[PDB]
Design a protein around this ligand. Sequence first.
Ligand SMILES: [Ca+2]
Ligand SMILES: [Ca+2]
Length: 75
Amino acid sequence: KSPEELKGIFEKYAAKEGDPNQLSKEELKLLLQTEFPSLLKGPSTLDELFEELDKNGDGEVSFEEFQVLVKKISQ
Ligand SMILES: [Ca+2]
Ligand SMILES: [Ca+2]
């Protein structure tokens, strides 16, 4: 899908709790299993995907941080 469509998906989830703008490990899990099931059933564990994605270490994944995965998503 288009970039605007991914932001859309990102968005429904980031808002379920905490910062309505960023993903929590729970919200990322939720996103991943409903929308992209094989991202999370690869070599990394959700926990390990979370570490990779959280660049700062603020416990949230922003949309910009989320861009990494997109390559696999779009793939
Ligand atoms: Ca959130
Ligand atoms: Ca972060």
